[PDB]
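hiii so my PI (J.) wants the whole complex modelled not just the main chain, which honestly fair. so below is everything: two entries, each one labled with what it is. i double checked the lines twice but i was tired so who knows lol
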Amino acid sequence: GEVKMMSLLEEMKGIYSKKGGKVKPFEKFEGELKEGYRFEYEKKLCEIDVAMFGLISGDLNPVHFDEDFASKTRFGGRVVHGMLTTSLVSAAVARLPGTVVLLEQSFRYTSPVRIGDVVRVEGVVSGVEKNRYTIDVKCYTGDKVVAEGVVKVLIW
Amino acid sequence: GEVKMMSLLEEMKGIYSKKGGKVKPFEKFEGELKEGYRFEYEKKLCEIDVAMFGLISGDLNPVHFDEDFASKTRFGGRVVHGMLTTSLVSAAVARLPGTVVLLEQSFRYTSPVRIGDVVRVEGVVSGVEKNRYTIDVKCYTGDKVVAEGVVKVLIW
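here's the output for the full assembly
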């Protein structure tokens, strides 16, 4: 992995982008983390994201993949995996200043996310104990809440 | 993109497998879901899983990717994304009989996971209210708990 990883990542990035995936250059936020620090992160979730999430996890639930199957359900169409939506929260907190590790997450999924939706993560730091930061998080498509909850991160 | 999806998935499965990913064929579990129903699901997390998770989420945290950087943290090397580990829980519950959608998830990350680890998800249904099932979940590497929490699923 050392050189293997960044080489594999770069190789897969070129394929991923050509399949319609959005590349999010990785840049850390700045400022002083403390109660009330706010941040935001957004990404369009495309067919390739659903497919890749399915392969890496093994979650090939037809409700995310099969148009006629999903059309028959109460959702009336495919929906993105809920855990793909909230994967964006990992990306958002990873951009906080310092070295970031996830300790806790807790989400409720409130409305489905459709393929092609832009999901926006809004976080605000709510608690600080030593180097553990508690963060209130809501995920949106447009102005509609699609997930809500809390994460805790360790930041060195 | 109704019929582009299943073609995209099949094509990506080939690239994914060639890069070392484990293809986790999708088959449903069986039985009537009552309190005390227990299930397990496991998957080996490989370099390609970390890379793909990073691309789909945008989480390119150096702690998961950069050997030199990660080696200087207390982990002594790279660790996988916590949310990659618990993505396997989505895949586990997706296999429950019926049409499954995630309603809630809550996890604490207790010990890091590394490239090459087999993560085993153990679930037990702890409560049922109509078609909403509360499931206690622990993720393991061998005998060691790496994440623990609770999910709630809607099953039609």
